[PDB]
Design a protein around this ligand. Structure first.
Ligand SMILES: Nc1nc2ccccc2nc1N1CCCC1
Length: 154
């Protein structure tokens, strides 16, 4: 009863890359890069493809850092989001009709213009912790309840 999704954060020692969606899913918020996984495609392969297609970057090594399940009250399908980190990229991010990438110093993460769950798990990602999480939403701006715990293996 869930659909697989990937989310990739390009995290360097002093900055992180986010992209502003110009429309569709996530318009007007800063997002990591990702999307649905294809049939016959592993999750790690889906994440590499999604990062490259949406940001224009080429990634060597991806590290699995978390798994987050999203429930939207009333919607049957859960979103099972597999979160990845990387610091080994080649290229320059590309702005397209769909996405506007920007680098953010770690102290200037725009949490007020991101999703409400990001304020909870993003700090774990930034200090190299792995996590498993669950968030129940009503709409897109209200967390009804949640769980989030640090783990040794994702
Ligand atoms: N992190 C996200 N939180 C959301 C909360 C409510 C509604 C939608 C959301 N989308 C998110 N992300 C976009 C790509 C994966 C994570």
């Amino acid at each position: 009863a869930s659909r697989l999704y990937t989310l990739v954060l390009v995290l360097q020692p002093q900055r992180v890359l986010l992209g502003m969606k110009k429309r569709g899913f996530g318009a007007g918020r800063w997002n990591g890069f990702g999307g649905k996984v294809q049939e016959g495609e592993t999750i790690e392969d889906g994440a590499r493809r999604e990062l490259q297609e949406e940001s224009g970057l080429t990634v060597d090594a991806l590290h699995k850092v978390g798994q987050i399940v999203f429930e939207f009250v009333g919607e049957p399908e859960l979103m099972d989001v597999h979160v990845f980190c990387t610091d080994s990229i080649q290229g320059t991010p590309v702005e397209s009709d769909e996405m506007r990438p920007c680098w953010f110093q770690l102290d200037q993460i725009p949490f007020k213009d991101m999703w409400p769950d990001d304020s909870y798990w993003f700090p774990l990602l930034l200090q190299k912790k792995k996590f498993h999480g669950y968030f129940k939403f009503q709409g897109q701006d209200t967390i009804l309840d949640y769980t989030l715990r640090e783990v040794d293996t994702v």
